[PDB]
Amino acid sequence: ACTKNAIAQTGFNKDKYFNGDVWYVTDYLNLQPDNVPKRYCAALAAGTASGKLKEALYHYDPKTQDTFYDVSELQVESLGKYTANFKKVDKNGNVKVAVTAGNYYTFTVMYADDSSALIHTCLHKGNKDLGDLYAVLNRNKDAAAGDKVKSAVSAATLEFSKFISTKENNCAYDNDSLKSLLTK
């Protein structure tokens, strides 16, 4: 179930978030914890291409080896709040599963600055969803969450101590593939 209307950041700077670069997930929290694994690697690139907001996603489960990339076109609901389609692709952008009606995620940027962000997303696949997921992002894959993003976590009535870190997984990313997916 999707249960939260996530509040976008006051003064959100869209151009700085959607600048073409990679954001690494450093910490995450699902409100239905059994919906996601306890060990995981994820990253995204976010930018504008051909006049549209785009994200490219990467997921990797280091226990099962499941690996997948996605390309998304984001439509604007309001500043910092988006509805994204998705197509599953290989690292080279070859579509494995096309954009499909009712395959979408919502995406809200709750906080962002030059180095860090806090987002909310709820994923829909037909009549099922994967629950409310929060993620702390950083421009540096290893970086400890700083005071400002932690203040944003608390101001959303969340406890940072409940987030799961991706650090122990020593994740590695294909940054060229991921960023280049923005034009796919």
Scanning the structure block, which residue is given the tokens 């073409």? 20
Q: Which residue is nearest to ligand [N] (CB)?
A: 123
133 binds ligand [N] (CB under 6 A): yes
Say how far apart CA 165 and CA 127 lie, in whole Å. Answer: 30
Are the beta carbons of 166 and 27 closer than 8 angstroms?
yes
SS3 call for 168: helix
Partnered with residue 74 across adjacent β-strands are 53, 84
Q: How far apart are CA 25 and CA 101, in angstroms?
A: 27
Residue 164: CB minimum distance to ligand HEM, A: 8
- The HSE-up count of residue 31 (CA atoms within 13 Å, CB side) is 18
φ, ψ of residue 3 to 5 degrees: the values are -120, -10
> Is 25 one of the binding residues for ligand [N] (CB under 6 A)?
no
Phi/psi of residue 117, nearest 5 degrees: -155, 160
From the list ligand HEM, ligand [N], none, partner contacted by residue 70 (C-beta under 5 to 8 A by kind):
ligand HEM
| Least Cβ distance, residue 58 to ligand [N] (angstroms) | 12
State the nearest-atom distance from the C-beta of 25 to ligand HEM, in Å: 4
The count of chain residues that interact with ligand HEM, using the rule CB under 6 A, is: 21
Residue 143 near ligand HEM by CB under 6 A:
no
82 binds ligand HEM (CB under 6 A): no
- Tell me whether residue 124 is annotated as binding: no
Q: Interface with ligand HEM includes 134 (CB under 6 A)? A: no
Site string for ligand [N], 47-76 (x = CB under 6 A): ------------------------------
The binding site for heme comprises: 59
